[PDB]
UniProtKB/Swiss-Prot annotation:
Protein name per Swiss-Prot or TrEMBL: High mobility group protein B1
Annotated localization: Nucleus; Chromosome; Cytoplasm; Secreted
Residues modified as Cysteine sulfonic acid (-SO3H): C5, C27
Superkingdom of this protein's organism: Eukaryota
Modified residues (N6-acetyllysine): K10, K11, K12, K25
Tissues and organs where the protein is expressed, per its UniProt entry: Ubiquitous. Expressed in platelets.
Residue ranges annotated as motif Nuclear localization signal (NLS) 1: 9-25
Comment block on domains: HMG box 2 mediates pro-inflammatory cytokine-stimulating activity and binding to TLR4. However, not involved in mediating immunogenic activity in the context of apoptosis-induced immune tolerance. The acidic C-terminal domain forms a flexible structure which can reversibly interact intramolecularily with the HMG boxes and modulate binding to DNA and other proteins.
Residue(s) carrying Phosphoserine: S17
Native species: Homo sapiens (Human)
Length: 30
DNA sequence: GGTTTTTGTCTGGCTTCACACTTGATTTGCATCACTGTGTAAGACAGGCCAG
């Protein structure tokens, strides 16, 4: 799932390179 | 069902090779040479059963 989540968020966060720990937490929380 | 494991996910900044291009003198790869001895089998041949 995590790849798809991050791919969707590529536009959600306009140009940010997101953290590993926090992105894990977010994909986890959904 | 809980309790245990495998195997993924997301980045980048890292380390470690391969490739890039040239020249010409080495080094390798590979097929070939000339050549007889040896096995195999295509011949020839004397031989002996038997009939006129």
């Amino acid at each position: 799932f995590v790849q798809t989540c991050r791919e969707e968020h590529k536009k959600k966060h306009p140009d940010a390179s997101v953290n590993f720990s926090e992105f894990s937490k977010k994909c986890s929380e959904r």
